[PDB]
Amino acid sequence: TCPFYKKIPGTGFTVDAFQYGVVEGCTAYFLTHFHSDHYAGLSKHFTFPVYCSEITGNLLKNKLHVQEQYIHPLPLDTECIVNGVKVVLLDANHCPGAVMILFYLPNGTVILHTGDFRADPSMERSLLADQKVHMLYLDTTYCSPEYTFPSQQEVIRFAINTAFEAVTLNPHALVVCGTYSIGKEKVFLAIADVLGSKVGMSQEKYKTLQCLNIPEINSLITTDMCSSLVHLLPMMQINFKGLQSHLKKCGGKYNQILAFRPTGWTHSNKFTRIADVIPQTKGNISIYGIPYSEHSSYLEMKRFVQWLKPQKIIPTVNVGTWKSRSTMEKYFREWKLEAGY
Ligand code: NI
């Protein structure tokens, strides 16, 4: 049945709650972003109002064929009224089109649902600064102090410099980047830009990228693989077998692959600095695991919450085990006692 942490009290609203059939008494279904664990259940047969960003609405229409009449896109940073309740969508710093939702309940309670987010100090100067939040529905993906990672900027610097060096040494090397969803577009786009190439990809993936309002996208991507030296493939194919196979298909145009796997976290982060990352190599194939995250680190998450000072926190991730739930609640109490709220 629909879990409580997907329901917004004092409203008929749900968030990311499309796989439970008709939720009893739900008058509006919000969708924070276009990732499959969140949209699971939407299709052309869905006939209730869906509220979301413009970008998420482009993907619902074009990829899942949801009918236009049930898609209600809202502008960001704008007070809007939905079934008589004031709401604001804020940028979540996750994947394209991802939002956080502020609900202003008729009784005076203010609720923030972060969706999936990567907390950033820039959030401390949005419309969140203007009033108090009483309840926070928090993306707790990496809510443990072992989860450190570098900035997105530092990781893209590493990737650009690595790719540029490799291809300048060997003009017959191919760069490959893995993907399984929207998000992390900067990895492949920044590499193509330094190399003076477009990124080549499947028709399905080109379609998905054309829904994202990215500036000058027609200039950066293509379905012509032949004219491209940066290729995008499914994440599953980023292994020695899948890469050897792909290299066969390029018909002796290339004699080396440098591949990137943008993971979330991997335990090499406890020890390894970004400067110190090395690939796994077999023959003329090298694979780099790079820690490009679109979720908060532990310290980023802690800073955001100690700034916001919510009265109650409801985790939305890692809620299925007692040991995880109990450990998170202990961090929340620490943060509150350290900060004095
Ligand atoms: Ni997500």
From Swiss-Prot:
Tissue expression per record: Expressed in brain, heart, kidney, liver, pancreas, placenta and skeletal muscle.
Gene induction: During mitosis. The mRNA encoding this protein contains an internal ribosome entry site (IRES) in its 5'-UTR. This 5'-UTR generally suppresses translation while specifically promoting expression during mitosis, when cap-dependent translation may be impaired.
Localization terms from the record: Nucleus
Top-rank taxon: Eukaryota
Coiled coil (residue ranges): none
Subunit description: Binds constitutively to TP53BP1. Binds CDC27, which is itself a component of the anaphase promoting complex (APC). Binds PIAS1.
Role of this protein: May be required for DNA interstrand cross-link repair. Also required for checkpoint mediated cell cycle arrest in early prophase in response to mitotic spindle poisons. Possesses beta-lactamase activity, catalyzing the hydrolysis of penicillin G and nitrocefin. Exhibits no activity towards other beta-lactam antibiotic classes including cephalosporins (cefotaxime) and carbapenems (imipenem).
Name of this chain's protein: DNA cross-link repair 1A protein
Lineage: Eukaryota, Metazoa, Chordata, Craniata, Vertebrata
Span covered, complete protein: 700 to 1040 of 1040
